[PDB]
Design a binder for this molecule. Structure first.
Ligand SMILES: Cc1ncc(C[n+]2csc(CCOP(=O)(O)OP(=O)(O)O)c2C)c(N)n1
Ligand SMILES: [Mg+2]
Lengths: 385, 103
């Protein structure tokens, strides 16, 4: 990626070259070529797509990634801020009003809530029937309140809340679409829900009976980074994707990459460079996204749901975040990883950072600016009534 | 229909409590996520104080009182508007329909 490796120097930056339709142009300067390549492939979204064999599906991804993320409207921007406010408000209620919930915290990975919302909303606009979710413990009660839509009374009243299943409806803010949302039951044994969830989706598709052009129930599956690279059930289930009795039209995969297992680091967890490298065995695209840029996270959710409907294959999203607290209720993570938890302790939250960025681009009026402040107090008063 | 003269009605077309009916018959009526609101609409998308409905010389008006998401009348953002029968009003993810009474 250095210009010295390709026998080019600073003296070539303002000379013009033939580029063969790159950026919809025949000629361009090296300065302009470098600008565009860096804007497309080196900021907050990293893409792996050139290993795909079909020319038509390689060109579709190339054109969308090099056009860039569209500039979102003010209304859109305020809707992303309201979801982050709700996510953080619920984390505070759980930590204060109940005990032994530090294990199950989503603090560090609050952008998960606006990513899942983006995908479910895109599916409702496509005209599809249901979304089935499978996931582990981390963030489960947050997903029950902010994505499935259960009341607080229902959540807080055999087995625990962290393993039972639920159903709900998702209406579309800026459209006329509705869609059902379901959450599957599972044990503590990691990744054992993967094949069970796929089977539930195929049974529901068969009952609707819409043919090959159908496939109108979307599977959304959440993993952790250590479990995804380590347990063999993960690639065993992806191998059923294109077979005759087992095909469900693709699976959207989200890997929450918080750069730690329990007391174990990625060096001692996998022999692959990234955790999502099984994608290159099955010929599918991978999007790596920064969990502290919420506008980039909502774009990747939309693009992945559009790729599934067009090509009917699996798609993989890597959400790079961190884990604020330890896995145990009373356990110090600096005991084993002291250098990593120097960087983590005493940061600003993703909500705080995004509020500061909107109030410092001068788009918002005086009346509009007061409202952004008051929204976080409203969400808090509501949960603690 | 059998509505008293000078009154009006709002009915929930789309939302969790769809089919619910509310009666506009007093000079000011409040609508939001505050539990002491006249029209209580419980959802994350609605603000604690969101809009008021006001009756002034036999004429019905909607007014935004400083919400984050704003109020829409027939899929167009407005700060105040006088409503005619069969108009769609959006407060969050709730959509309501306005029906006048006898004069
Ligand atoms: C099959 C199985 N093996 C081992 C465990 C023990 N276990 C519980 S939590 C955990 C760590 C998982 O780490 P990761 O998948 O990276 O996600 P994180 O919880 O850090 O988000 C392990 C090994 C388990 N629950 N199930
Ligand atoms: Mg992890």
């Amino acid at each position: 990626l250095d210009i010295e490796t390709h026998n080019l120097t600073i003296w070539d930056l303002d000379r013009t070259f033939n580029v063969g339709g790159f950026g919809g142009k025949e000629t361009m300067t090296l300065r302009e070529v470098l600008s565009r390549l860096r804007a497309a492939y080196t900021l907050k979204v990293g893409s792996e797509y050139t290993h795909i064999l079909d020319r038509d599906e390689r060109t579709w991804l190339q054109d969308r990634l090099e056009a860039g993320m569209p500039k979102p409207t003010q209304a859109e921007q305020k809707y992303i801020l309201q979801k982050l406010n709700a996510a953080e408000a619920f984390e505070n209620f759980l930590q204060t009003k109940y005990v032994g919930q530090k294990r199950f915290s989503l603090e560090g990975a609050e952008a998960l809530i606006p990513l899942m919302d983006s995908a479910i909303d895109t599916a409702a606009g496509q005209g599809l029937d249901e979304v089935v979710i499978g996931m582990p413990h981390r963030g489960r009660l947050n997903v029950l309140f902010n994505i499935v839509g259960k009341p607080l009374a229902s959540i807080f009243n055999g087995d625990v809340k962290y393993h039972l299943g639920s159903e709900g409806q998702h209406l579309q803010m800026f459209g006329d679409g509705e869609i059902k949302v379901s959450l599957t039951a599972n044990p503590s044994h990691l990744e054992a829900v993967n094949p069970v969830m796929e089977g539930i989706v195929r049974a529901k598709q068969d009952y609707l009976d819409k043919g090959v052009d159908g496939k109108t129930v979307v599977p959304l599956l959440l993993h952790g980074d250590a479990a995804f690279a380590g347990l063999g059930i993960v690639p065993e289930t992806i191998n059923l994707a294109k077979l005759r009795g087992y095909d469900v039209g693709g699976t959207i995969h989200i890997v929450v990459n918080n750069q730690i297992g329990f007391t174990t680091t990625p060096d001692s967890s996998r022999s692959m460079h990234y955790a999502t490298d099984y994608a290159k065995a099955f010929g599918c695209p991978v999007f790596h996204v920064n969990g502290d840029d919420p506008e980039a996270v909502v774009w990747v959710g939309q693009l992945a749901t559009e790729y599934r409907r067009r090509f009917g294959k699996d798609v993989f999203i890597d959400l790079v975040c961190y884990r604020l607290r330890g896995h145990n209720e009373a356990d110090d993570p600096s005991m084993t990883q002291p250098k990593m938890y120097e960087l983590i302790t005493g940061r600003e939250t993703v909500r705080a950072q995004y509020t500061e960025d909107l109030l410092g681009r001068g788009d918002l009026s005086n009346e509009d600016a007061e409202a952004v402040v008051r929204d976080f107090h409203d969400q808090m008063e509501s949960v603690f009534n | 229909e059998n509505l008293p003269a000078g009154s009006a009605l709002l009915v929930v077309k789309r939302g969790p409590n769809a089919g619910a009916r509310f009666l506009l018959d007093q000079p000011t009526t409040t609508a939001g996520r505050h539990p002491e609101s006249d029209i209580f609409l419980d959802d994350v998308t609605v603000s604690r104080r969101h809009a008021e409905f006001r009756i002034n010389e036999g004429e019905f008006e909607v007014v935004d009182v400083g919400s984050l998401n704003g109020t829409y009348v027939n899929r167009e953002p407005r700060n105040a508007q006088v409503m005619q029968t069969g108009d769609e009003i959006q407060i969050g993810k709730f959509r309501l329909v306005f029906l006048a009474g006898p004069a």
